[PDB]
């Protein structure tokens, strides 16, 4: 069985035991996260959302809050002496899926 | 003496012109391009 | 994150036969190009040849509407001064139609190492018979 769940302004395909990374969620390590914006379910079945499956959810466990690898942004405009430099580390939350309800 | 903290707004870091483009005081160093005023000693009398 | 990228050999690749009788050069070529690039398959991956192998027969009966038999002119140049040689599409349909469909489809494939590799998957015959029965190929309808 698998599902499709909306998270962080986007949709991800999800199975149990799968280790997932998403945008930052308010939630500490070990805590539990309920995704109620399930779009689709598959596996020995098929129930289609219009847009969301009524009453279906997904449960997951926060394994880490983190900031990803250091990205360097740099823009320049030639012969105009404009340079600009910026760092970024997009904060993420790591999840482990428990089950699909 | 290891704690000296003079008054605020009494002291202020010298502008240092011509040490980069990110300073905004770089290449031309506040003089613009190519005139009598962009030159060393450039300018005219006061009147 | 995670979306499928094919691999060379990851995909079955089939052998198709087309009767080119009466169909217009361009329409047939447009269908063949897409077959070779692999856009009829959802295993498509732009940097990999997922496409199929293709055979064309009765190419000397390929359709040419209008006065293209006399007025559509193919050109070659030898890179020598005045080394320009012209030939008509109808004349080519008569004598060397294989080169005709080759020319049509080459301009409709991508202009890369891959597209050159894809051109090799095309086997053209002005007749009704081909050499590739060992591959036991299937008919494709446009």
């Amino acid at each position: 069985m698998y599902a499709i769940i909306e998270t962080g302004g986007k949709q991800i395909k999800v199975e149990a035991g799968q280790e997932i990374y998403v945008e930052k969620l308010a939630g500490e390590v070990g805590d539990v996260v309920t995704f109620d914006k399930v779009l689709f379910v598959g596996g020995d079945s098929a129930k289609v959302g219009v847009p969301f499956v009524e009453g279906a959810t997904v449960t997951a466990k926060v394994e880490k809050q983190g900031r990803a690898k250091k990205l360097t942004v740099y823009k320049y405009k030639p012969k105009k002496n404009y340079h600009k430099k910026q760092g970024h580390r997009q904060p993420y939350t790591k999840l482990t899926i428990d089950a699909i309800n | 003496l290891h704690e000296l903290k003079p008054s605020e707004g009494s002291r202020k870091e010298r502008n240092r012109v011509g040490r980069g483009t990110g300073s905004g005081n770089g290449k031309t160093s506040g003089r613009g391009h190519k005139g009598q005023k962009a030159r060393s000693g450039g300018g005219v009398r006061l009147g | 994150r995670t979306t499928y990228m094919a691999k060379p050999g990851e995909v079955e690749r089939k052998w198709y036969v087309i009767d080119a009788t009466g169909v217009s050069l361009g329409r047939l070529s447009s269908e063949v190009a897409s077959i070779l690039r692999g856009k009829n398959k959802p295993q498509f991956t732009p940097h990999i040849d997922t496409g199929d192998f293709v055979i064309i027969i009765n190419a000397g009966k390929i359709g040419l509407t209008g006065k293209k038999a006399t007025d559509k002119i193919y050109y070659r140049h030898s890179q020598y001064p005045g080394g320009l040689k012209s030939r008509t599409a109808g004349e080519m349909r008569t004598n060397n139609p294989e080169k005709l469909l080759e020319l049509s489809i080459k301009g409709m494939l991508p202009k890369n190492s891959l597209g050159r590799q894809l051109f090799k998957k095309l086997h053209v015959y002005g007749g009704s018979e081909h050499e590739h029965a060992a591959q036991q190929p299937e008919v494709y309808e446009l």
Binding site: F40, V48, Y74 | - | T3, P42
Partner: protein, 116 residues
């Protein structure tokens, strides 16, 4: 007091040059070329982070369409039927299903084909 320009110049330039790693010849060795290769790579990466999203949407669409032609719909009528039906699953998921769960892709295509 005097300030010899010691050690900061070469620290900075080494840092740039090591960021110029993997490049042809003098680009991974020499600062005057490496600096501008590094800048150009940064700029290319900036705009490729935008072009990448376009490219993937393009591929997603292509695969969806290749999969819906088998079911005798086009991408266009498929998307239309899906909006009418009201499900907002996206191109990425549709491609994943088209390439791995073709049965479920076809289920959704049938639902669209009904809503039309």
């Amino acid at each position: 007091p005097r300030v010899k320009g010691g050690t900061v110049t070469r620290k900075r330039r080494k840092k740039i040059v090591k960021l110029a790693k993997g490049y042809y010849g003098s680009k991974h060795l020499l600062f005057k070329v490496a600096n501008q290769a590094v800048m150009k790579s940064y700029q290319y990466a900036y705009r490729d982070r935008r072009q990448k999203k376009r490219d993937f949407r393009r591929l997603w669409i292509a695969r969806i369409n290749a999969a819906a032609r088998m079911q005798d719909l086009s991408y266009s009528k498929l998307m239309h039927g899906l909006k009418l039906a009201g499900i907002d699953i996206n191109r990425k998921m549709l491609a994943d299903l088209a390439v791995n769960d073709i049965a479920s892709f076809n289920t959704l295509a049938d639902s669209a084909k009904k809503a039309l």
